[PDB]
Amino acid sequence: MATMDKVFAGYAERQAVLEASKNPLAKGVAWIQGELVPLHEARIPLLDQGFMHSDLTYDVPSVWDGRFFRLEDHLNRLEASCKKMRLRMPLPREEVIKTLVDMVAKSGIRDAFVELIVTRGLTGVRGAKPEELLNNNLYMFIQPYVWVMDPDVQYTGGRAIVARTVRRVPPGSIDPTIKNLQWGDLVRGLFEANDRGATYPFLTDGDANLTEGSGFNVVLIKDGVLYTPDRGVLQGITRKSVIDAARSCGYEIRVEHVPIEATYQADEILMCTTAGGIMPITTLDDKPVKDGKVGPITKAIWDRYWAMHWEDEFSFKINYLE
Amino acid sequence: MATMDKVFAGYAERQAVLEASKNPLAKGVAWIQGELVPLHEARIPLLDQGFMHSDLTYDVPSVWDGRFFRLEDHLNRLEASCKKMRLRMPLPREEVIKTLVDMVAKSGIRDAFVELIVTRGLTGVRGAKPEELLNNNLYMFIQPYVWVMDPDVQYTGGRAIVARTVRRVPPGSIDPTIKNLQWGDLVRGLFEANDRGATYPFLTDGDANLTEGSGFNVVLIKDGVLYTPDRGVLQGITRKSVIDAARSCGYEIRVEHVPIEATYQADEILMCTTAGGIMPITTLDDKPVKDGKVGPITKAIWDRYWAMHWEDEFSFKINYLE
Numbered sequence: 223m224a225t226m227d228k229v230f231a232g233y234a235e236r237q238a239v240l241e242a243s244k245n246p247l248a249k250g251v252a253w254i255q256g257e258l259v260p261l262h263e264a265r266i267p268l269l270d271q272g273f274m275h276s277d278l279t280y281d282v283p284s285v286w287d288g289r290f291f292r293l294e295d296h297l298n299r300l301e302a303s304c305k306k307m308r309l310r311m312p313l314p315r316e317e318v319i320k321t322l323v324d325m326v327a328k329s330g331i332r333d334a335f336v337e338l339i340v341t342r343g344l345t346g347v348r349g350a351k352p353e354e355l356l357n358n359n360l361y362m363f364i365q366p367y368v369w370v371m372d373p374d375v376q377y378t379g380g381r382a383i384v385a386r387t388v389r390r391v392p393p394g395s396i397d398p399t400i401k402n403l404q405w406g407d408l409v410r411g412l413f414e415a416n417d418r419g420a421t422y423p424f425l426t427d428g429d430a431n432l433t434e435g436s437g438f439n440v441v442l443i444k445d446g447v448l449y450t451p452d453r454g455v456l457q458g459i460t461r462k463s464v465i466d467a468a469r470s471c472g473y474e475i476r477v478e479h480v481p482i483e484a485t486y487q488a489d490e491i492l493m494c495t496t497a498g499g500i501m502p503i504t505t506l507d508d509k510p511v512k513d514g515k516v517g518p519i520t521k522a523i524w525d526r527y528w529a530m531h532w533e534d535e536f537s538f539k540i541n542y543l544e
Numbered sequence: 545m546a547t548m549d550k551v552f553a554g555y556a557e558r559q560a561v562l563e564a565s566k567n568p569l570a571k572g573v574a575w576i577q578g579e580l581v582p583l584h585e586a587r588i589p590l591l592d593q594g595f596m597h598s599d600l601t602y603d604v605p606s607v608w609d610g611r612f613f614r615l616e617d618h619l620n621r622l623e624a625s626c627k628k629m630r631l632r633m634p635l636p637r638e639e640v641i642k643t644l645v646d647m648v649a650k651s652g653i654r655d656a657f658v659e660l661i662v663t664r665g666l667t668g669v670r671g672a673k674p675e676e677l678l679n680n681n682l683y684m685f686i687q688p689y690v691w692v693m694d695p696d697v698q699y700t701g702g703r704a705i706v707a708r709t710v711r712r713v714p715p716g717s718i719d720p721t722i723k724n725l726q727w728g729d730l731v732r733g734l735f736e737a738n739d740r741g742a743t744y745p746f747l748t749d750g751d752a753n754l755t756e757g758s759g760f761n762v763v764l765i766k767d768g769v770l771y772t773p774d775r776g777v778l779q780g781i782t783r784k785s786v787i788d789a790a791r792s793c794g795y796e797i798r799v800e801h802v803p804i805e806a807t808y809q810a811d812e813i814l815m816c817t818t819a820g821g822i823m824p825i826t827t828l829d830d831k832p833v834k835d836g837k838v839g840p841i842t843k844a845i846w847d848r849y850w851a852m853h854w855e856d857e858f859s860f861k862i863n864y865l866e
């Protein structure tokens with residue numbers, strides 16, 4: 223399984239079973255202070271600082287065909303984000319994983335979006351001593367796999383703009399390697415994209431370089447070489463997988479500063495994210511990207527990315543039997 | 545009532561009554577989808593985009609001695625913030641005010657922190673059509689008045705640092721005139737201040753100008769003239785009241801770019817915010833601000849700001865009798 227047709231046929235088959243389910247957890251499940259609740263019924267304390275000041279980090283691993291994909295990479299990134307924020311995982315890792323796998327199994331969901339959120343808790347940083355800020359809260363949930371680009375659009379590629387009315391929050395305000403939900407710039411980018419008849423905004427760093435978009439990294443392909451911005455962006459696990467895939471497929475990939483001009487000169491463009499995978503861009507600022515077709519290197523990356531989902535090195539099988 | 549002793553003595557007497565109250569709502573009350581809930585019991589949906597992507601705006605008016613202070617100014621600012629964010633107030637203004645005054649009356653709180661939050665609702669911007677993003681959510685709560693600087697400390701002033709490890713989110717990322725809860729830079733500032741043995745961080749715009757701090761505006765006084773940053777900051781209602789007070793007292797106040805160097809040259813420094821009022825700063829970067837005492841112009845502004853709380857132009861009396 224890794225041509226688009228094969229990957230999507232498997233998804234379609236599993237999705238048909240899931241859409242027919244009468245399981246009250248089939249639309250997702252949340253873990254709230256040690257209790258499982260259907261996702262759409264889940265509630266959190268008003269006073270949680272994750273809401274009061276978006277004072278949190280989070281991470282989103284995924285399950286594909288009943289297999290957790292790169293879960294340890296996501297959990298290590300979450301731990302790193304927590305350390306940077308002076309937060310601590312409220313449960314030890316074996317309990318986190320045990321709980322996630324139980325949630326997935328109970329839901330019956332085979333292709334899942336999985337989110338963990340660690341918040342400061344009920345006491346705000348403002349006016350507190352460090353010792354008063356150690357009771358951090360954890361929220362976790364799973365839901366049916368989410369597509370930032372629908373399967374059918376991945377065949378043709380999507381429409382992007384380089385945002386001109388907004389730029390990325392600079393690392394000296396918020397470190398973008400700490401995964402966070404402070405989406406003020408990204409939401410402005412989304413509205414700009416919609417106003418300009420596109421779906422995906424690419425944000426600059428306000429100094430004429432490409433950064434990332436609204437929840438995805440961006441990779442440019444130029445003369446058989448892949449390029450992706452180093453600074454100013456989340457170091458995506460999908461991006462990590464694209465770096466692995468490039469080397470697997472025998473291409474070079476450069477993680478470095480990418481002048482915005484390079485977007486206009488690119489042979490192929492793709493976006494990457496856990497919620498959707500490898501997402502080609504074939505129109506930029508209302509003009510085709512080269513010939514306006516999904517490029518061959520993109521297709522090689524696409525196939526290898528998905529093939530990784532069935533390899534032990536990158537995934538593990540969840541037991542759904544209860 | 546306008547000298548510190550008199551204003552704080554009134555608060556202390558009301559507080560003693562409030563602390564002795566057995567009414568569970570004396571600790572605060574929230575409005576959640578048309579229902580009043582004790583504040584610490586209040587819960588919001590996990591899927592609310594106000595939590596999921598901090599996709600919201602808010603505003604914080606106040607009640608002092610049973611009088612709402614400049615409520616219309618806060619509601620107009622909240623309406624202006626909503627318009628900029630493509631949000632709409634979920635209730636008409638007469639219902640908002642009626643609900644807030646009912647909540648205050650039920651709680652018995654005479655000196656109150658009041659918060660209104662308007663979120664995108666349960667549907668995220670990413671992947672939506674404009675018409676799918678109109679079901680916005682409202683949350684409101686009141687709690688006992690919050691002090692960003694305690695009354696006793698206001699006599700002698702607090703310790704600030706100019707932040708060096710973080711700068712303010714630029715307006716080209718997030719417009720700081722839209723009041724918001726995306727505090728990543730402000731929380732970084734709070735941690736830096738605590739690491740450096742201070743309480744209040746002043747953030748620069750990353751281009752050697754003063755902006756604001758973690759939930760307060762900053763006003764410098766130099767040779768009898770007041771100065772406060774124009775760009776890069778929330779246009780505070782307390783700041784508005786300081787502008788009013790300055791003119792009332794016969795001082796000039798300039799709202800303009802304030803090079804960071806001016807902070808070090810200032811005769812007096814104050815912070816201003818709804819949650820605590822007029823808060824003198826007497827130590828900056830471990831050095832006294834001039835003689836290290838609360839200055840005379842600060843004290844004039846202080847008294848006038850508080851006197852405005854009993855004037856009909858700026859306040860209205862809540863009826864607590866049921």
Ligand SMILES: *Cc1c(COP(=O)(O)O)cnc(C)c1O
Pocket residue numbers: 282401402434435436437438439456457458459460461494495496497
């Ligand atoms: C999560 C995220 C991405 C993609 O990261 P993955 O680990 O590939 O899912 C890209 N940009 C931003 C801003 C993000 O928060």
Ligand SMILES: *Cc1c(COP(=O)(O)O)cnc(C)c1O
Pocket residue numbers: 604723724756757758759760761778779780781782783816817818819
């Ligand atoms: C609310 C706020 C202030 C102070 O505004 P007031 O209207 O005086 O309460 C200052 N800075 C920031 C960043 C704020 O959100």
